[PDB]
Amino acid sequence: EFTPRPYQVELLERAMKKNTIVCLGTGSGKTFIAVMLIKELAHEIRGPFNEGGKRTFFLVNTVPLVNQQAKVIRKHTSLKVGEYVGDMGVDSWNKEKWNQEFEKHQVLVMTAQIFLDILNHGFISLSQVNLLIFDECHHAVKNHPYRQIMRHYKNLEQNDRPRILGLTASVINSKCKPNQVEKKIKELEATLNSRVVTASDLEEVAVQKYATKPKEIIVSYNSDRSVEFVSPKVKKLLEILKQYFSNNNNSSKELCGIIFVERRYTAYVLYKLLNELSAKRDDDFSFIKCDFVVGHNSSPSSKEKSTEMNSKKQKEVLKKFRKGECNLLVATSVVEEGIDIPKCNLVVRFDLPKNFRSYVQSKGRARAKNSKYIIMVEEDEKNKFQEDLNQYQEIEKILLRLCHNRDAPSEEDFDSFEDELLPPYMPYGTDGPRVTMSSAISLLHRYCSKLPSDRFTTLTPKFTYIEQNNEEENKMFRCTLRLPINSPLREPITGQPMPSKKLAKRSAALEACKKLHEMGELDDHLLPVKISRKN
RNA sequence: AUACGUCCUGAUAGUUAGUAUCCAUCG
RNA sequence: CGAUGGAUACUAACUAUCAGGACGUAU
Numbered sequence A: 001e002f003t004p005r006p007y008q009v010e011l012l013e014r015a016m017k018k019n020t021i022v023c024l025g026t027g028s029g030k031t032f033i034a035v036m037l038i039k040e041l042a043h044e045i046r047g048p049f050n051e052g053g054k055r056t057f058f059l060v061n062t063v064p065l066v067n068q069q070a071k072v073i074r075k076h077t078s079l080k081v082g083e084y085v086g087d088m089g090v091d092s093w094n095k096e097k098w099n100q101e102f103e104k105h106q107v108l109v110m111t112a113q114i115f116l117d118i119l120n121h122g123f124i125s126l127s128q129v130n131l132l133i134f135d136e137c138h139h140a141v142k143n144h145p146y147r148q149i150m151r152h153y154k155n156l157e158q159n160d161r162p163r164i165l166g167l168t169a170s171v172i173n174s175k176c177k178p179n180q181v182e183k184k185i186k187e188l189e190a191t192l193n194s195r196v197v198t199a200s201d202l203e204e205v206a207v208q209k210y211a212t213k214p215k216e217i218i219v220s221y222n223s224d225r226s227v228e229f230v231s232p233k234v235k236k237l238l239e240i241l242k243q244y245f246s247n248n249n250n251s252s253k254e255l256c257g258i259i260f261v262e263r264r265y266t267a268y269v270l271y272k273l274l275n276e277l278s279a280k281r282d283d284d285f286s287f288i289k290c291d292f293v294v295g296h297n298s299s300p301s302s303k304e305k306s307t308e309m310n311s312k313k314q315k316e317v318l319k320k321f322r323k324g325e326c327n328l329l330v331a332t333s334v335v336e337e338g339i340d341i342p343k344c345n346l347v348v349r350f351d352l353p354k355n356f357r358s359y360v361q362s363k364g365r366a367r368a369k370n371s372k373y374i375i376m377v378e379e380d381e382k383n384k385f386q387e388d389l390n391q392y393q394e395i396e397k398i399l400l401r402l403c404h405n406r407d408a409p410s411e412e413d414f415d416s417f418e419d420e421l422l423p424p425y426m427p428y429g430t431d432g433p434r435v436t437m438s439s440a441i442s443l444l445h446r447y448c449s450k451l452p453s454d455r456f457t458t459l460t461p462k463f464t465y466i467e468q469n470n471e472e473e474n475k476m477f478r479c480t481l482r483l484p485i486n487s488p489l490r491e492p493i494t495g496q497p498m499p500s501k502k503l504a505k506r507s508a509a510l511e512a513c514k515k516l517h518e519m520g521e522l523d524d525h526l527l528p529v530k531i532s533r534k535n
Numbered sequence B: 001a002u003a004c005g006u007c008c009u010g011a012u013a014g015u016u017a018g019u020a021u022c023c024a025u026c027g
Numbered sequence C: 001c002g003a004u005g006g007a008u009a010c011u012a013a014c015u016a017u018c019a020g021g022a023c024g025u026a027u
């Protein structure tokens, strides 16, 4: 029942020296050793939470992946595991419930932002956290919540060891030139205080996992000039699916084809058209079934129509695909990574990739033999797309060339973090509710929304911007806060002048937390009057 | 005829700010 | 409603270089 991997046991013993990051292609099995390293330190986690024990947290950005990884860890381990997501509405939960939750479970898999929230209000500090692994660590750039969490390491002492981990295949998240990749990798390895390694030998990975991705049958059309009325791209899909049927006459019923899109409306219309064609019972199209996977809760009541509700729908649709009930798939932005099917040999790239990372991630989804990669390109843009593809190939070649070990001898880069020009409130020191400079906006989201209050758009009570000349004539901004009649007086009516508008708002709104803490609205854990709504 | 210097539309490559549009993820 | 990331476009400044337009110096 247990399925090992030869290179990964070597990877584990190499990584169990210091902080180490593994970078490999899709299908490598890098995620699998997460459970092995979790069980390697299971003894520490056994500590009771009477005075604060050791617990392991697994951060996953996407909501459909938390249950999948929870089932994966449950399959090989007997430890109690729960699932956490803001869909349940945990915004109105007091300290005692959280203490009960921590004492009950053993591993709490949860998205990043909820971890931001819990660390923001001091329900528990970074102390006594046994281990912590990111998801898609290549997102840790600029003001990503990953970096916001990592910033809390600066406030605490270095002697503490809340080990951090994060796994990614592509180390970029935007378009770039082959002369800035070294700068990007150096910056990323400096930010998270960890080295990056990659398997030197890629035997099986090149056999069927990564280096033998589906062959790119670049097919063009004339779309730049219901199937026959909309752009002929749908006709190209029909022709390529007829080619698929001609290839797989033996499997004339169905296969595991997956369609990637970038706009939800396109996916919805595409699924509707193919379901209509299949239900018609015509000779050309009679055995096609597709279902939704993407869209997410979006918003409870604010200008949306998808209404994907709870994760139960995603769980059941993925189960019905795994059992073969669902065989065609359309989605936009949740099945790029973390979706695994043991037998898949066809991926249709209906919409073009936008950067390097998307192209690498959405290409290795197929894992079976003779897999098919299909790209929709136009004739006029064919030259530009060909040169862009050559650039991507060169980027991959140089990236695998620089796969040599890169250490971090200069720890000064970690100290070189661009600290904000103003300090935030912190009434109880480093051991108390350390308010972050980036959580002032979260606090101001819901002015007096707690307790009986209007349901109108009180979130944005409007602010006045004032500009004046200065010594360098770059101008300074006077952000002013004028809240309506809903609460007692406020100290930060206007903030300190700032070079930028955003920093002006931050300086004019951060002192609200400091003022409100003294007057008694908040508490020891900065939870306002322990009631629903508001952070 | 060459070289150098001041300002600028054009070009090569990077940074910063504002603005406008679009997309995705999540609370 | 909000925090974000990405993409394009405009203005605008600095940064290392090329060219041309307005002027000056050495040969």
Ligand SMILES: Nc1ncnc2c1ncn2[C@@H]1O[C@H](COP(=O)(O)OP(=O)(O)O)[C@@H](O)[C@H]1O
Residues within 6 Å of the ligand: A003, A004, A005, A025, A026, A027, A028, A029, A030, A031, A032, A033, A338, A339, A340
């Ligand atoms: N030995 C194995 N046992 C079970 N599943 C596997 C194995 N090897 C690969 N897989 C499947 O293939 C996928 C590859 O996962 P892994 O190599 O851990 O990282 P990634 O998912 O990033 O490629 C997994 O989602 C898993 O379901």
